[PDB]
Amino acid sequence: RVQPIKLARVTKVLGRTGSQGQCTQVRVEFMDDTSRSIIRNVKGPVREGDVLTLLESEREARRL
Amino acid sequence: MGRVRTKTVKKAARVIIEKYYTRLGNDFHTNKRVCEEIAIIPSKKLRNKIAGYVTHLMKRIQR
Amino acid sequence: HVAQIYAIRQSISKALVAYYQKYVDEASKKEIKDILIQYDRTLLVADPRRCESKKFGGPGARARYQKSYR
Amino acid sequence: VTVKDVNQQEFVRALAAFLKKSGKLKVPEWVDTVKLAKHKELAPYDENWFYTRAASTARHLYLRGGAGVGSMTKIYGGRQRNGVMPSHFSRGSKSVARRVLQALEGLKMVEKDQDWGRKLTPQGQRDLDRIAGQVAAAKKK
Amino acid sequence: TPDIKLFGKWSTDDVQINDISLQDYIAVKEKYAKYLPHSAGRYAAKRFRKAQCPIVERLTNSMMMHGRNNGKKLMTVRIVKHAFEIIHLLTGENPLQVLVNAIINSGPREDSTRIGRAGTVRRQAVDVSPLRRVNQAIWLLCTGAREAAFRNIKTIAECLADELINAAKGSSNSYAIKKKDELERVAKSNR
Amino acid sequence: PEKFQHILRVLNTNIDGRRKIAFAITAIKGVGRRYAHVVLRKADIDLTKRAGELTEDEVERVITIMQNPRQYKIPDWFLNRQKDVKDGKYSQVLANGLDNKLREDLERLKKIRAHRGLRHFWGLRVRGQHTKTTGRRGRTVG
Amino acid sequence: TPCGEGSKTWDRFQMRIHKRLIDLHSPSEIVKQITSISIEPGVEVEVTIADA
Amino acid sequence: RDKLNNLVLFDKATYDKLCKEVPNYKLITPAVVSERLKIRGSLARAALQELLSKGLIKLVSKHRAQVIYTRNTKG
RNA sequence: AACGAGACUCUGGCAUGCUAACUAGUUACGCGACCCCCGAGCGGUCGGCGUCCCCCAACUUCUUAGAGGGACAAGUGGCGUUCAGCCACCCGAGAUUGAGCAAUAACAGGUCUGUGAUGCCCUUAGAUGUCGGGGCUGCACGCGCGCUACACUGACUGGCUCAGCGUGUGCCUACCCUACGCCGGCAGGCGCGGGUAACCCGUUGAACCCCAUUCGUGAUGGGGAUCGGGGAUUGCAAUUAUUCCCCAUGAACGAGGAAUUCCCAGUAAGUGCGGGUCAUAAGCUUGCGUUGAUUAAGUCCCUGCCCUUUGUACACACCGCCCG
């Protein structure tokens, strides 16, 4: 939220979701500890080994 | 890619490897020229496919 | 005007390479070939792409006229 | 130099000036009533258009093997807006170009040469290349 | 390096990327320097192939829209030579560093999307690819100058160079940095 | 510099000193832009400055060079009117006389009562044009 | 379509002719000898008096 | 569209400001002179041509559709 | 086992290999001629720039068209039952450049106004088969395909600079494409000449583009509707203005509501040219080049289509059936 901006990187891509395939599920490692991992929903066309810029990590996702 | 080989290729490929078993290499180019000479092929493009599958069979048959 | 610039550039580049391969030696042109292909911009090959034919039922080679229902 | 070695936008604007300095050319009566091509909507911005067009005429005769009044017009023609109707190509005036070529020919820098069509006189070819090196000498190409 | 190419006036070294999340999606200096932003290019036929062509080239491509400027890419390079010139005089920075900052400050970090549930509109907040950030950021700042010069005495060159200053700074007096925060403001809400 | 004067009145229409000379003059009817870039050059004056920078001596000459164009050697084909019809000469018509001349030719074609004057009086297109899908305005539908 | 109706379709037809020429220099008798022999299919031939 | 009007001739104050804008401005184009003063763009075009003849400003780039001018290269 | 699918045919991308060229070029000098010192040098000489000159010169890279060759998931690494295949990568031009052709069964779909294809009925000398002049363009409305605009990433005026598919008299009963010279502001007129066409028009010196002037955010010079006056060309004839030209006249329009169309690489969009119809004439259609992006590498959400399972009071098939 108002906590410092986070950075987390892809470990694996899972598959595309959304109601037109518009969203992409991905599994990400938190890039400050690899024992911490969350699944996210990401809009853009992601690949492997890319880094993202999360504005929170309070949220936890698994589908929309 | 797409494209799975048709039945005309897989049918005749089997015949051609069986009766001229000892006349095949494991190279494309040699096996191409052989198929042209030991049999009629009604096209050139058709030959280039059937040769390549004849080659691919000959790899596994030695295992 | 544009396509002429790419043609003349591609020719003089290729001219230089061929000249060294033929009257000087292999290692002469090998260096020069490596330099060009680093910043390749089709400096040793020709662009395959050319225009595709117009087929009826629309302008252009892929666009279609408007279709109205009722 | 050869006129090829120097800039050509610069060449003409100095060749026009040469003629106008030397008292050269015979100029038509019509010079403030002239559209200067069919497709144009307005008269020239410049009164020295006769001198200007004679520059560009003489330049082309050096390059290509020379041809008649028809070909000169074809070089000059451009696009014609037709308002609501879509554009077309057209070829400009004739009687202006026929006076241009005849005025040059009056100084004997052009001439109706072999196979019925204008060609540039050897004296003419001399004078082009004479100021052609003055351009390169002046600024520096 | 001993044959280092400029833009014909600008260094492609001394160009920083201030993210680790956007470096290697900015292309400006690995060997991507060129004297012009015109090429035959390959921007298609494989998904990962867009990120391999310069940022300066991408910029020229993305500012030629609205149905009368298409097929006039040569006019577009005229606008780019003036743009960088004005940016360098105006603040003093190498005008590529300006552009890289302008991209990094304008990219949205979360965006919303649609989901159909119960026959009523629900929205979901989601994140974004690095490749998405770049595509968006190049679009947005170019939209400002395109709009501004559409009935003004000011020319397109002047408008575009002004917009890259206010983007490269955190000023928030631009069409880009306005709209960036608008999107994030939605993404907080329906998070 | 040159603060001397601005907007002025000339024959039948008020002409601003704000605009360039040629384009300023065009507001007067019977004079287009094409007609003005000629007449200025016959008068041998600049067209590269404003209309408010002309002096009274200069503009006095302008109207003379305008209203006797044949006598200052502007060709006959370049005029508005060649053999008006039933007046017997080449003529050049300017602002308030243009309207008077125009209204005559309308009246004439209803005098004889050709196809022309009938189409005029009915308020329908004179020239070969379809009126089925043209004009509109309109309203009153079924 | 005879009498327009249905989607607008067209059809490209083409005929390709071929021309080619052999230059000889020899006596005109032996030419007309060798010309007239060994021709069976529908193929046209045109003999010329002289050329520069 | 809006209603606006610009001055198509010079005045005292225009000339005096014209001399003093120079060391203060890095960019000077006719468009920027349109805004800072109330002056027409073609008037402003020629106004800057005058200054260049004095050597107060320096040309740095030229085009059909734009002209750019700089200070005195003193920072 | 058969048909459709692919296979096939045409088209595009790859050959300094083969075959051979005054209706295609190049190179090489010989050059002599012109030209300028234009470059080393001096102006000579040597070289550069193109044209005539070129050959019984040399050659076929460029242009042309024939036979051949080349591309196979072939190679490598993953993945798969280790099968069929799939993904990435090497090599190199990636196995997919685009069309043509296209099944069974069906529709009361369109066409008797293409047919001397055709049934039946009708009419037939006061003719439904010929001449003269008129109409198919007539306008309170409504709707569809398009064209041009609302400007400054522009208009205007000069200057610079690049293509491709074709077509052409000798045909029907009568007609072509045009160089060149002259006259005219223009439209155009007039005098001569070539072309049955890789030969002549035409090295088709096209447009946007490019460079420099002018205009200045103003319904302005943006826009060119409407309309006045005049000149040409075609035809037997131009009135309801065939077409073209000249001057004048100077409207709506300031980026578009509810909705909705089309498109994935030389593709969209900008931009011009040839053919078709043609005595005169493309805002149409059909082909051709030139300039040339953004965005996706997905999904079944909507619209629709294919296959399986299931339910049915439906079979005129949900645009169905049926109740008070």
Domain range annotation of chain D: 1-141
Sign of CA dihedral H25, H27, H32, H33: positive
Does residue F115 contact residue F127 with C-beta atoms inside 8 Å? no
Task: For strands D79-82 and D85-89, give the pairing.
Answer: antiparallel
Structural domain including H12 reads 1-75
Task: Kindly give, in sequence order, each residue whose CB lies less than 8 Å from that of residue E67, ignoring residues fewer than 6 positions away.
Answer: none
H or E segment and range at residue F10? strand F8-10
| CA separation for the pair H75, H60 (Å, rounded) | 15
Of D126, D12, D116, give the one whose Cα is nearest residue D65.
Answer: D116
Q: Is the dihedral of CA G40, G43, G49, G52 positive or negative?
A: negative
Give D40-47 contacts, CB < 8 A, sequence gap 24+: D40/D92, D41/F34, D42/F33, D42/F34, D42/F37, D43/F34, D43/F37, D43/F38, D47/F41
> Under a CB-based contact definition with an 8 Å cutoff, are residues F40 and F21 in contact?
yes
Look at the block and give the residue holding tokens 């490209």. G12
CA distances, F60 to each of B23, F10, F30, F54, F90 (Å): 110, 10, 18, 10, 23
Question: How far apart, in Å, are the Cα atoms of H72 and each of A15, E83, H24, H67, H75?
Answer: 61, 21, 10, 16, 8
Interchain CB distance below 8 Å, C41 and E40? yes
Q: Do F38 and D43 touch (CB under 8 A)?
A: yes
10 Å Cβ neighbour count for D107?
A: 17
| Tokens (6 digits) for E7 | 């833009």
Q: Which residues on chain E are in Cβ contact (under 8 Å) with A23?
A: 113, 126
| Dihedral angle of Cα B44, B48, B54, B56, to the nearest 10 degrees | 180
Judging contacts by C-beta atoms under 8 Å, the chain E residues touching residue H1 are 151
> For residue G49, how many C-alpha atoms fall within 13 Å in the half-sphere facing its CB?
0
The answer to whether the beta carbon of residue E27 comes closer than 7 angstroms to any atom of strand I is: no
**I291 closest protein residue (CA to C1'):** E71
Three-state secondary structure call for residue H69: strand
Total domains, chain E: 1
Using CB atoms, pick whichever of A7, A42, A64 lies closest to residue E129. Answer: A42
Alpha helix ranges (H) inside chain D: 8-21, 49-63, 69-76, 95-106, 122-138
Structural domain of residue E47, as residue ranges? Answer: 1-191
Report the structure determination method.
cryo-EM
Angle of the D49-63 helix axis to the D95-106 helix axis, nearest 10: 80
User: How many residues in total does chain A contain?
Assistant: 64
β-pair type (A37-42, D85-89) = unpaired
Its sign, for the CA torsion H62, H66, H71, H75, is negative
Instruction: Decide if D84 touches F, using CB distance below 8 A.
Output: no
Give the resolution value in Å.
3.5
Q: Which of E5, E174, E137 is nearest to E59 (CA)?
A: E137
Distance CA E110, CA E122 (A): 17
Q: Is the CB of E98 under 7 A from strand I?
A: no
Q: What is the DSSP letter of A48?
A: S
Q: Report the distance from CA of residue C13 to the C1' of nucleotide I28 in Å, as an integer.
A: 25
F73 CB and strand I closer than 7 A? no
* Residue B4 phi, psi dihedral angles, 5° rounding: -115, 140
CB F18 within 8 A of CB F6: yes
Residues after which chain F has a gap (C–N > 2.5 Å): none
Strand partners, D112: D118
Say if residues H65 and H23 touch (Cβ distance below 8 Å): no
Residue E178 carries which side chain, given as an amino acid letter?
A: K
CATH of the domain at H2: 1.10.10.10
What domain range is A3 assigned to? Answer: 1-64
Give the orientation angle of helix E73-91 with respect to helix E156-168, to 10 degrees: 50
- The spacing between the Cα labelled CA in D89 and the C1' in I175, in angstroms, equals 28
Q: Do F12 and F93 touch, CB atoms closer than 8 A?
A: no
CA angle E102, E105, E108 (to 5 degrees): 125
3-state DSSP call for residue E24? coil
What are the Cα distances from residue G10, in Å, to C53, C68, G2, G4, G6? 15, 21, 12, 12, 12
Rounded Cα distance, E132 and A46, in Å: 9
Nearest to E86 by CA among H26, H33, H41: H26
User: Are A57 and A39 a contacting pair, CB within 8 Å?
Assistant: no
Peptide bond into A15 cis (omega under 30): no
Residues 121-140 of chain D within 7 A of strand I, judged by CB, are: 122, 125-126, 129-130, 133, 137
CA of D30 to C1' of I200 (A): 37
Q: Strand I within 7 Å of which CB atoms in A 29-48?
A: 44-45
What's the number of domains chain A is made of?
Answer: 1
Which residues make beta-bridge pairs with H69? H28, H59
